[PDB]
């Protein structure tokens, strides 16, 4: 919960002459950008402790980072930019994406195979509390709706989702096959699912040799009660 | 604006000479008409701000244009007329009907591919409150019944649908394929579902080159858990 | 609820010398008849307002009609005859049986195709109130049992169906294909389901060119949550 | 429940030339009369079986009697007259008013002692069902409110009394001391409570030698869980 | 024995010549009698074992002697007769009416001191089951209403007493003082309460030297929480 | 009439020249006035039917005269003014204030005997719904708080009174004795309670010969269970 | 009649010389017999009205004929004997076994086509009341367990079936095809299911030309929701 | 809720050279002072709008005032001083302390009569939520404990008071009799209760001619459901 300190670090970070500009000129083109790039190196340089936390707790850090930009933004109300990081020094071979990397910032190189259709998902679900009829919004991260814990106003524990009041976002999946030039006879290359959202959607194509950076997440499949790991894409570049 | 501010704006557009008569002739012919066509351009002339809301919140705006007409006719004959706008500048290509356009008024060109059977659907569902046995009517917009939030009379939260007291309405589904003259090799055209209801039913047929204007809606496919977009047709025109 | 007046109109109607007889001579052959025919014309003539209500609210009118016969019948206890109407001036083409005709008296011409097996259904379901163990009978119109709203004696809302105390009735379905001599190349004739009950059972045969008269009802199919219209047969004649 | 037959007997009874008049001329002076007198003898004569039932079930009979007058009264809506009987041949000594006479028509002679103040009571209590908020009226006979058994509309069993919607009536009590000219040395005369309502209120005075006619009722006193008998006055005359 | 074995034994005692007629004359005079006196000695002659149970379990025995008479009369006129035994050998002195005698048939001599007013009490309370609204009658033995255990029809456990449908019965209280000719200096006589009901009401008066025969019952005094013994009079005789 | 029909009638009486100004001057001086006196006679002139309702249903009528004034003032300053009628023909002698007059507008003469201390009472009670924590205000007319029927927002039925948010109002009690010049020997005058509130507080004193005009209300005395009548003062005048 | 009136009638038929011995010989051989055959004709002779009920309400009648025998045997050895009637005049052709015959005693001729495996079924299910843990036995007639309505001892409504304490019974299914000598071209014979239980098990085989006598029962086919008729065999005979 | 602005005004107010000192030198002697005096005039001068709000909403203002001092206090943790105001220009005669002054800052002159004993009360009650066992503190203002609305952590609505964890405060009451030198023959001077808490305790003595300043509060007495006004003392000075 001391991540409040992290917010501060980013607040300052987003004050350095160099960054302060790309931020503004980005908030300029809204909503034709949504993203602000960040060279991992500048972060490494300016405060190497934070640069480490990004790797251990991507989600939290990336949240605090976005929070800062919202604060240091007068004039243009709202505006939520996704901040993507480039040059992550934590490249990891596909085959090694096991449990230790669950929920960690990762960079994986490979070749894009199958690319699924682009479809929406709810990012901000709005619920109606069945206890007092009040409305509560809850940010979703998966395609599985997550109801509020309890209603703080009346103590209710039962909610009804109001789709017409919820906000959507574009989502897409693809297969990231590992590079062959490292295998050794007989071995049929392995692959992992990558999830691209918002503006990283419709960015990659079957064949693209790339380096996907992002958070390694996991999900248990229905029926086959087994988990499966996938990468929640943050930044992407060609090799 | 708020909804109320809009109703007014509309009550005047529907009072202007040019449309004053069209409205009465329709209210007159009911139910041999149901529709009342309005030129977008005229809406712009009368007001540029309203002609914009029509695109950002077509649902409420159109629901307002209906309460306006219902507030004009001399005989207060109720009459649920369909306001259909013609000539919409907001023309979006099919492949680009992503999330940003959910809930927005769009206009898409393409070619009617497959046409489905006309079936009815409940538009006004009547429920019996299991708490006090009173009756409540609730307007439905999808083919999925939506029960009332709670019974205002006794506080009940459980209802039973009374089909025999509900009002139906004809609905129809068809696939709209994108224009071929823009695809580039190895590219199979993408199609999208269009929903036609009331008097727009049985209006189009395979081959017809059209410019479907309507609200972009989304719906989660049962068992797949994935959302999919479709167009709720408002106005149709040939090219 | 003012249909009580309708009961009266039929009471009188079933007093005219002409009708008063076929009634009695019908109640004579019980239970080898069950039906009393009614020339729509005599109804049209004697009270043209009622003749109109039949079309708008078949079920209610036909109920009030049957109610009358029960009242104007001393001596032979019970005896419930179905009254069927001939010569309905509301003939409608098969293809046009849309929502406006849901719950309306209709006459449709066509050719009988597939004819299903004759099977029973419950017409009068008897329920045991789980609250006070009392018995309640409820008339069913579909093959889906409909429990009582609530128990008037104790306020119970939960019931158990007692099959052994319920009354059955013969039911049958068939397909009524539209007449071809009106189509126009390429068009594969459409069809609709007809439901024949009680003594209209085993009356039609594949091939019969007929004119089915009855109430247009609708039902949502399981799985495919879509509705489908069908005709609840009242009278039938050959062309 | 066959008391419906009793209603009939009174309907006829209140058709005899002689009575039919005092009824009308009474309904004339409303609301300056409220009472219609009935010579027990005429009742004895015309139908001696009814004349007996009055004695065994005063309340029911007197109800059916009042019901009749309401039926045989066109023109002046409402109007509820109390019918009082004179010349009851069931005179009983005060000291003998034991259990056998509970709920029986009785005539008792004595001298009026203490006379209490005149105060109102609720005759028709209106309740709000806490289940569905509907209103139910219930006739009260004592000064203790009696809630409905259950709500027939929703099955509710809990009610709230709405005083502002209830109707009141004047009530009064007095002591009827037994006649001394029948005692025998040492014996301190006994007494019983008489309850006078509506227009018999403020009719008797301490000292009046009278003959009270009415229904013998009983009530258990709080604290001292013992019952006590009293007379619910119907008719009164001086000796 | 069991209760049944006793009923039989009694059905014969009540069939013997000597008493055969007394029973019929009583059943005949009902309700101008209510009682049927039987000499204990005769009971001994007819059977010594039954004449004993009468003392060990007077309640059940007497309840049996009643079901017997009720099973003899020709007209099955019901008739709740009071069997009263005369000449009981089990004579216990007043001061010795302790616990061993609770529930036993005793006979105590003394002198009627103070006599209380005759009041009624419910003998047969009728309850309305709050579960199914059905009516249940329950015989009461004390002046404290005893609700049914549970409703056999619906399983309900909550009841409402319907006073207007309940049957009353006259009851009376008096103090019985021990015989003075046995006390020894500085000893104030001890008294005990006697309860007289039905036809035994208003039978004794101060001064009367009697030999009260009845069941010894006990009751806890409210607020004191202490039990106290009293005699439930069955038969009275002067000395 | 209905309530609405009355409001109108009043909105005009309060628009007439003669009273147009009195109303504004009062609305002006608020809250240094609160009252607005109106001559009954003038009400008769303006309308004889309304001047009658004032007597049959003073409560609603007066509640209407308030909504009228509240619907006239230019500044919509709310202002809860007290309409007080002067010169009421419906003068009833004290001893005759029985049930027929409960809820009616009366005028009684007598002499102020005893005067009680002025205390406040809640006029507008504010409750917190225990279901959703929302606040509801409810106008009180007695000194007994009356909770809301149910919460319309969530269906709750349980509330908690929030005294610190409720509005108070001064109330006062006094005994009004009947005029002595009409009693006839051995007759002690009868008194009745009068309740004075708002600006009528501390207006009368012992000895004052007055003509209290107000609504006759009744209330059950706790522990006694007996109703008692009292006058809710509207207008006072000296004789 | 009522059930009781019938039991008597039967107790006499089973007392007549001709059958007096058959019954005893059977009760004697139990359980090496179970059945007791009776000629319908004899039933007619003994009584024509009873021989009719047997057809209109075979279930109750047969249940009565069983309670009769159970009320005759000297040793009160219980013995659940099967009464099977021979030579039934009520012979109905297979294709005509519609609703009017549900619950009726019929006799149908045809040819045993397919025979199923003999399996057991619970005839007397024993349940443990989850409320008080008591045991209740309930006779089953179908292969679908039917729980008790409610527990009379404690009012419970929830039960658990105790298979190890329940009694089984052999049951068997076979298809009965209509006689071929009556069909007319292109007509494939219709078959109906027959259920054979107890000693009738493994009695018939393919090819056997028979005249199945039994009760016509109906049952709803799970998942189809459609009823289907079948014959519950009582007596079998070859042709 | 905009009282946050009031907090600010006091924050500034408590920064003026003059006040900033007495604050500090007061926080110096803790806990031997508890109070900081405030000349109403300085408040009147510096910001006359606030000086008015004090009178209308004493409680809120005085709260915001105390809140400020807590904020502008570094170094010495805790320390809650009561701020008392002197020289209130809202002196009001005792007899006029009616409803309009409920919850208003008031100054009343009079002579101290009876002085009650000093006793403690709970100022900060600590409750244990019966739902999750968590602890909640709630400031009390009366001697009647006020439980929390609901538990924000788990939604619980039931609490248990933990006396051993609650904080107490000294409280005292006295009678403030009005000054006689203003009455006029016969009039027996009136009085009102004053409540002195914390350090104003044991400050006044019978006889002291004083001017009590404070908030007028009201409370309904048990039994006698009537309210009574009293003064919650804030500042006191001698005349
Ligand atoms: Zn809530
Ligand atoms: Zn409801
Ligand atoms: Zn029930
Ligand atoms: Zn209700
Ligand atoms: Zn029950
Ligand atoms: Zn609420
Ligand atoms: Zn049980
Ligand atoms: Zn909690």
Radius of gyration of chain H (CA): 19
D31 upstream amide cis, omega within 30 of 0: yes
Identify the closest residue of chain F to A134 by CA–CA distance: F132
The answer to whether G8 touches G61, Cβ cutoff 8 Å, is: no
Give the pair of three-digit tokens for residue E41. Answer: 């000695």
The CA distance from A156 to the nearest CA of chain F, in Å, is 9
Q: Is the Cβ of F146 closer than 8 Å to some Cβ of chain D? A: no
C31 upstream amide cis, omega within 30 of 0: yes
**Interacting residues of A231 by C-beta distance below 8 A, sequence separation 6+:** A97, A106, A108, A176, A192, A193, A194, A195, A212, A214, A215, A216, A217
Instruction: List, as own/partner pairs, every contact residues E3-6 make where C-beta atoms lie below 8 angstroms and the sequence separation is at least 24, other chains included.
Output: E3/E60, E3/E63, E3/E64, E6/E50, E6/E53, E6/E60, E6/E61, E6/E64
Residues of F in contact with A160 (CB under 8 A): none
Query: Distance (Å, rounded) from C-alpha E38 to C-alpha H69?
Result: 97
Q: Which helix (H) or strand (E) holds B16?
A: none
The answer to whether C170 touches C201, Cβ cutoff 8 Å, is: yes
Query: What are the backbone angles phi and psi of residue A159, rounded to the nearest 5°?
Result: -130, 160
**Interacting residues of A211 by C-beta distance below 8 A, sequence separation 6+:** A91, A107, A108, A109, A236, A237, A238, A239
**Interacting residues of H172 by C-beta distance below 8 A, sequence separation 6+:** H115, H116, H117, H118, H119, H195, H196, H197, H201, H202
Q: Is the Cβ of D199 closer than 8 Å to some Cβ of chain F? A: no
**Where would I find the H helices in chain H?**
4-13, 17-28, 40-45, 50-56, 58-71
**Interacting residues of A96 by C-beta distance below 8 A, sequence separation 6+:** none
In angstroms, how far apart are the furthest CA atoms of chain B?
Answer: 64
Residue B174 β-bridge partners: B115, B194
Query: How is G13-79 classified by DSSP, letter by letter?
Result: HTTSHHHHHHHHHHHHHTTS--EEEEEHHHHHHH-TTHHHHHHHSHHHHHHHHHHHHTTT-TT----
Residues of D in contact with B131 (CB under 8 A): 131-132, 154
Query: How is H144-205 classified by DSSP, letter by letter?
Result: S----S--TTT----EEE-GGG-EEEEEEEEEEEPPSTT--SS----EEEEEEEGGGTT---
Query: Distance (Å, rounded) from C-alpha H237 to C-alpha H213?
Result: 9
Work out the angle at residue G160's Cα, subtended by the Cα atoms of residues G158 and G165, and round it to the nearest 5 degrees.
140
| Half-sphere exposure in the Cβ direction for B140 (13 Å, CA) | 23
The answer to whether F86 touches F40, Cβ cutoff 8 Å, is: yes
Radius of gyration of chain C (CA): 19
Q: Which helix (H) or strand (E) holds E104?
A: none
Work out the angle at residue G84's Cα, subtended by the Cα atoms of residues G79 and G87, and round it to the nearest 5 degrees.
160
Q: Is the Cβ of D156 closer than 8 Å to some Cβ of chain C? A: yes
The CA distance from B202 to the nearest CA of chain D, in Å, is 45
Tell how far the Cα of B2 is from the centroid of ligand 6, in angstroms: 26
Q: Is the Cβ of G149 closer than 8 Å to some Cβ of chain C? A: yes
Ligand nearest to the CA of A151: 1
Query: What are the backbone angles phi and psi of residue A46, rounded to the nearest 5°?
Result: -70, 90
Identify the closest residue of chain F to H95 by CA–CA distance: F118
Rounded alpha-carbon distances, angstroms, from residue C9 to C56, C226, C234, H129: 16, 39, 21, 69
Method: X-ray
Ligand nearest to the CA of H156: 8
Only one residue has tokens 């538990």, namely H151
Query: Distance (Å, rounded) from C-alpha F148 to C-alpha F161?
Result: 10
Contact state of F98 with D121 under an 8 Å Cβ cutoff: no
Tell how far the Cα of C140 is from the centroid of ligand 3, in angstroms: 20
The answer to whether C194 touches C212, Cβ cutoff 8 Å, is: yes
H157 upstream amide cis, omega within 30 of 0: no
Residues of E in contact with G155 (CB under 8 A): 150-151, 154-157
Work out the angle at residue B167's Cα, subtended by the Cα atoms of residues B162 and B171, and round it to the nearest 5 degrees.
120
Tell how far the Cα of G150 is from the centroid of ligand 7, in angstroms: 8
Ligand nearest to the CA of C132: 3
Task: For an interface test with D, give the residue of F57, F58, F99 to mutate (most D CBs within 10 A).
Answer: F99
**Interacting residues of H127 by C-beta distance below 8 A, sequence separation 6+:** H135, H136, H137, H138, H147, H148, H159, H160, H161, H162
Residues of H in contact with A134 (CB under 8 A): none
Give the pair of three-digit tokens for residue F187. Answer: 């007759």
Query: Distance (Å, rounded) from C-alpha G159 to C-alpha G149?
Result: 10
A31 upstream amide cis, omega within 30 of 0: yes
Do chains D and H touch by CB distance (3+ pairs < 8 Å)? no
Give the pair of three-digit tokens for residue B181. Answer: 């003259």
DSSP assigned state of B238:
B
Beta strands E167-177; E226-235: pairing state: unpaired
- Quick one: which of C60, C72, C71 has its CA closest to C20? C72
Using a 10 angstrom Cβ sphere, with 0-12 exposed, 13-18 middle and 19 or more buried, the burial of residue F72 is: middle
Q: Is the Cβ of F134 closer than 8 Å to some Cβ of chain A? A: yes
Provide the residue ranges of all domains of chain A, joining segments of one domain with +: 1-90, 91-120+170-239, 121-169
**Interacting residues of H43 by C-beta distance below 8 A, sequence separation 6+:** H13, H50, H51, H54, H85
Only one residue has tokens 């009308």, namely D24
In angstroms, how far apart are the furthest CA atoms of chain H?
Answer: 64
Instruction: State which CATH number among 3.90.1300.10, 3.40.50.1360, 2.20.28.10, 3.40.50.620 fits the domain covering C121-169.
Output: 2.20.28.10
- Quick one: which of A25, A46, A88 has its CA closest to A233? A88
The annotation status of E20 as a binding-site residue, yes or no, is no
Query: Distance (Å, rounded) from C-alpha G127 to C-alpha G145?
Result: 10
3-state secondary structure of F41: helix
Beta-carbon contacts below 8 Å between A and F = 19
Query: How is D119-182 classified by DSSP, letter by letter?
Result: EEEEEEEEEEETTT--EEEEE-SSSS----S--TTT----EEE-GGG-EEEEEEEEEEEPPSTT
The CA distance from B157 to the nearest CA of chain A, in Å, is 9
| Surface of F (208-227) touching D: CB under 8 A | 218, 225-227
Of A152, A156, A157, the CB nearest to H152: A152
**Where would I find the H helices in B30-170?**
40-46, 50-56, 58-69
Contact state of E118 with D98 under an 8 Å Cβ cutoff: yes
Contact state of A131 with F134 under an 8 Å Cβ cutoff: no
The CA distance from B147 to the nearest CA of chain F, in Å, is 16
Give the pair of three-digit tokens for residue E33. Answer: 């009698």
Contact state of E119 with D150 under an 8 Å Cβ cutoff: no
Q: Is the dihedral of CA H124, H130, H135, H138 positive or negative?
A: negative
- Quick one: which of D133, D122, D100 has its CA closest to D168? D122
- As residues whose CB is below 5 A from the ion ligand 3, the structure lists C 129, 131-132, 151, 153-154, 156
- Quick one: which of F173, F200, F182, F184 has its CA closest to F113? F173
Query: What are the backbone angles phi and psi of residue A216, rounded to the nearest 5°?
Result: -85, 120
Asked if the domains at C1-90 and C121-169 fall in one CATH topology, the answer is: no
**Where would I find the H helices in F75-221?**
none
The annotation status of A106 as a binding-site residue, yes or no, is no
The CA distance from E223 to the nearest CA of chain D, in Å, is 12
- As residues whose CB is below 5 A from the ion ligand 1, the structure lists A 129, 131-132, 151, 153-154, 156
The answer to whether H146 touches H162, Cβ cutoff 8 Å, is: no
Tell how far the Cα of E133 is from the centroid of ligand 7, in angstroms: 21
Query: What are the backbone angles phi and psi of residue E8, rounded to the nearest 5°?
Result: -55, -60
Beta strands H35-39; H82-86: pairing state: parallel
Chains with ≥3 CB–CB distances under 8 Å to D: B, C, E, F
The answer to whether D143 touches D121, Cβ cutoff 8 Å, is: yes
Rounded alpha-carbon distances, angstroms, from residue G183 to F223, G178, G187, G206: 90, 9, 6, 20
Chains with ≥3 CB–CB distances under 8 Å to F: A, B, D, H
- Quick one: which of C83, C80, C108 has its CA closest to C95? C108
**Interacting residues of A233 by C-beta distance below 8 A, sequence separation 6+:** A194, A195, A196, A197, A200, A212, A213, A214
CATH topology of domain C91-120+170-239: OB fold (Dihydrolipoamide Acetyltransferase, E2P) (2.40.50)
Contact state of A153 with F132 under an 8 Å Cβ cutoff: yes
The CA distance from H161 to the nearest CA of chain A, in Å, is 21
The annotation status of H133 as a binding-site residue, yes or no, is no
Rounded alpha-carbon distances, angstroms, from residue D192 to B227, D96, D206, D229: 84, 11, 14, 7
The answer to whether H107 touches H189, Cβ cutoff 8 Å, is: no
Task: For an interface test with C, give the residue of E130, E132, E136, E152 to mutate (most C CBs within 10 A).
Answer: E132
The answer to whether B180 touches B199, Cβ cutoff 8 Å, is: no
Using a 10 angstrom Cβ sphere, with 0-12 exposed, 13-18 middle and 19 or more buried, the burial of residue H49 is: exposed
Contact state of D152 with C152 under an 8 Å Cβ cutoff: yes
Q: Which CATH architecture group holds C1-90?
A: 2-Layer Sandwich (3.30)
Q: Is the Cβ of D155 closer than 8 Å to some Cβ of chain F? A: no
Residue F213 β-bridge partners: F107, F235
| Dihedral-angle region of residue G155 (phi above 0 means left; psi in -120 to 50 means alpha; beta otherwise) | left
Query: What are the backbone angles phi and psi of residue F77, rounded to the nearest 5°?
Result: -65, 20
Query: Distance (Å, rounded) from C-alpha G47 to C-alpha G29?
Result: 29
**Where would I find the H helices in chain C?**
4-13, 17-28, 40-45, 50-56, 58-71
Rounded alpha-carbon distances, angstroms, from residue A18 to A15, A25, A41, A45, A63: 8, 12, 13, 13, 21
Ligand nearest to the CA of A157: 1
Angle between helices E3-13 and E58-69 (to 10 degrees): 50
Q: Is the Cβ of A41 closer than 8 Å to some Cβ of chain F? A: no
Using a 10 angstrom Cβ sphere, with 0-12 exposed, 13-18 middle and 19 or more buried, the burial of residue A17 is: exposed
Residues of D in contact with B132 (CB under 8 A): 131-134, 153-154
Query: How is chain A classified by DSSP, letter by letter?
Result: -TTHHHHHHHHHHTTSHHHHHHHHHHHHSTTS--EEEEEHHHHHHS-TTHHHHHHH-HHHHHHHHHHHHHHT--SS-S--PEEEEE--S-B--GGG--GGGTTSEEEEEEEEEEEPPPEEEEEEEEEEETTT--EEEEE-SSSS----S--TTT----EEE-GGG-EEEEEEEEEEEPPSTT--SS----EEEEEEEGGGTT---TT-EEEEEEEEEEEEPSSS--EEEEEEEEEEEE-
3-state secondary structure of H234: strand
| Half-sphere exposure in the Cβ direction for C160 (13 Å, CA) | 15
Tell how far the Cα of H168 is from the centroid of ligand 8, in angstroms: 24
Task: Give me the resolution in angstroms, 1 decimal.
Answer: 3.0
- Quick one: which of C232, G209, D118, A129 has its CA closest to F154? A129
Task: For an interface test with F, give the residue of B149, B153, B155, B157 to mutate (most F CBs within 10 A).
Answer: B155
The answer to whether B126 touches B166, Cβ cutoff 8 Å, is: yes
Identify the closest residue of chain D to C153 by CA–CA distance: D152
Query: Distance (Å, rounded) from C-alpha B227 to C-alpha A143?
Result: 9
Contact state of E120 with D99 under an 8 Å Cβ cutoff: yes
Contact state of H149 with F170 under an 8 Å Cβ cutoff: no
Ligand nearest to the CA of E129: 5
Q: Which helix (H) or strand (E) holds C15?
A: none
Contact state of H226 with F143 under an 8 Å Cβ cutoff: yes
Give the pair of three-digit tokens for residue D174. Answer: 């007095």
Neighbours of B199 (CB within 10 A): 15
């Amino acid at each position: 919960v001391d991540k409040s300190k992290t917010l501060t670090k980013f607040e300052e970070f987003f004050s350095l002459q160099d960054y302060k500009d790309r931020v503004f000129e980005a908030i300029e083109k809204y909503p034709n950008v949504r993203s602000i790039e960040v060279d991992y190196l500048d972060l490494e340089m300016f405060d190497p402790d934070l640069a480490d936390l990004l790797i251990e707790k991507p989600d939290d850090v990336i949240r605090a980072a976005q929070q800062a930009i919202r604060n240091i933004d007068r004039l243009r109300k709202n505006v939520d930019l996704n901040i993507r990081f480039s040059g992550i020094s934590n490249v990891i071979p596909l085959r090694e994406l096991r449990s230790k990397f669950i929920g960690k910032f990762v960079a994986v190189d490979g070749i894009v195979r199958k690319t699924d259709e682009i479809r929406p998902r709810i990012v901000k679900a709005v619920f109606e509390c069945r206890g007092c009829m009040r409305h509560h919004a809850v940010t979703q991260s998966t395609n599985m709706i997550t109801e509020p814990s309890l209603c703080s106003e009346c103590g209710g524990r039962s909610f009804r989702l109001l789709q017409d009041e919820s906000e959507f976002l574009d989502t897409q999946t693809l297969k990231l096959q590992e590079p062959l030039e490292n295998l050794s006879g007989g071995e049929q290359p392995r692959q992992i699912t990558v999830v691209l959202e918002d503006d990283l959607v419709d960015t990659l194509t079957p064949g693209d040799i790339v380096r996907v950076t992002g958070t390694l997440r996991t999900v248990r499949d229905e029926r086959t009660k087994r988990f499966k790991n996938f990468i929640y894409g943050n930044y992407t570049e060609f090799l």
